Amino acid sequence: NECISVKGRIYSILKQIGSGGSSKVFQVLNEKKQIYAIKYVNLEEADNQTLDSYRNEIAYLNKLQQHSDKIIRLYDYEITDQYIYMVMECGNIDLNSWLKKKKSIDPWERKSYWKNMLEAVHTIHQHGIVHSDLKPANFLIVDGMLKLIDFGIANQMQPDTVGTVNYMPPEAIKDMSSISPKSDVWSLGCILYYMTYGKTPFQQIINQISKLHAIIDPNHEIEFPDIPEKDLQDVLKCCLKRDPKQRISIPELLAHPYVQIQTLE
Numbered sequence: 735n736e737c738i739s740v741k742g743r744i745y746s747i748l749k750q751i752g753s754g755g756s757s758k759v760f761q762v763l764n765e766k767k768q769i770y771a772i773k774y775v776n777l778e779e780a781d782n783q784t785l786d787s788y789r790n791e792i793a794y795l796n797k798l799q800q801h802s803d804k805i806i807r808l809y810d811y812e813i814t815d816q817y818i819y820m821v822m823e824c825g826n827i828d829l830n831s832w833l834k835k836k837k838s839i840d841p842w843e844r845k846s847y848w849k850n851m852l853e854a855v856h857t858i859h860q861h862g863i864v865h866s867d868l869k870p871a872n873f874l875i876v877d878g879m880l881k882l883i884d885f886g887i888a889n890q891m892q893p894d895t896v897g898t899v900n901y902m903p904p905e906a907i908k909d910m911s912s913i914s915p916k917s918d919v920w921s922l923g924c925i926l927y928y929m930t931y932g933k934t935p936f937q938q939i940i941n942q943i944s945k946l947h948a949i950i951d952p953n954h955e956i957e958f959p960d961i962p963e964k965d966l967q968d969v970l971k972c973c974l975k976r977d978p979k980q981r982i983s984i985p986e987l988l989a990h991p992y993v994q995i996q997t998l999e
């Protein structure tokens with residue numbers, strides 16, 4: 735198969751995991767048979783803005799991983815005026831593909847996944863990033879944890895063999911005319927919801943103007959089927975409050991019993 739050298743090292747291409755824009759992701763193996771992901775970006779045609787988004791991704795990636803191992807790790811990279819090669823921690827699969835296979839989630843793994851997401855999003859917040867477009871696809875499963883991959887600056891990748899609106903916070907939709915960490919809480923809540931109720935809140939409204947409306951509609955109430963874990967019920971409820979000022983914050987979520995008391999009640 736094709737190969738790829740990166741800063742004086744050779745990797746063999748198992749398969750292509752993903753693509754988007756002028757970039758590809760490959761599952762590869764190194765010299766010693768270990769497994770990695772490599773993102774390749776063809777800069778040939780690339781505006782000075784798109785160019786600076788890739789540059790920004792790499793910098794923040796390099797800074798943020800010092801502060802959390804819930805952020806997908808970047809080990810090495812080559813960047814020229816022609817190309818970018820990023821050698822990264824390779825995920826098993828992304829959370830949106832895993833969810834789409836409809837296998838229901840062990841409650842204790844859902845709770846642990848939730849910790850993972852909070853830790854990751856919390857540390858990007860602590861460096862001034864509000865993702866703004868969080869969705870299942872931003873998380874990869876490795877070492878039995880969820881790890882964040884795309885900080886929503888450089889354009890998001892898609893898996894190889896559309897994209898949705900279901901996680902869009904209300905403030906974002908009301909804002910289109912003529913930015914808060916709370917916005918990520920809403921999207922994180924929609925992911926949790928999905929992990930607990932099998933569906934995102936407005937995943938039934940198949941029509942998208944219809945869907946968009948519900949999200950911003952103070953009198954379209956979101957259902958919250960009662961469940962064994964009541965702390966989980968309460969987390970989803972405060973995460974999906976439409977007034978971002980009443981919505982719960984990450985630092986609050988980190989003090990919340992769902993996360994803090996290990997027996998799920």
Ligand SMILES: COc1cc(N2CCCC2=O)ccc1Nc1nc(NCC2CCCC2)c2c(C#N)c[nH]c2n1
Nearest residue numbers: 751752759771822823824825826827828831891892893
């Ligand atoms: C066998 O590895 C995988 C396989 C699958 N999928 C999808 C369905 C079938 C399958 O096997 C998904 C993910 C992985 N791992 C993986 N993916 C990556 N980018 C994939 C895109 C991220 C958004 C959706 C796709 C990166 C990555 C970057 N940038 C840095 N490490 C990475 N690790």
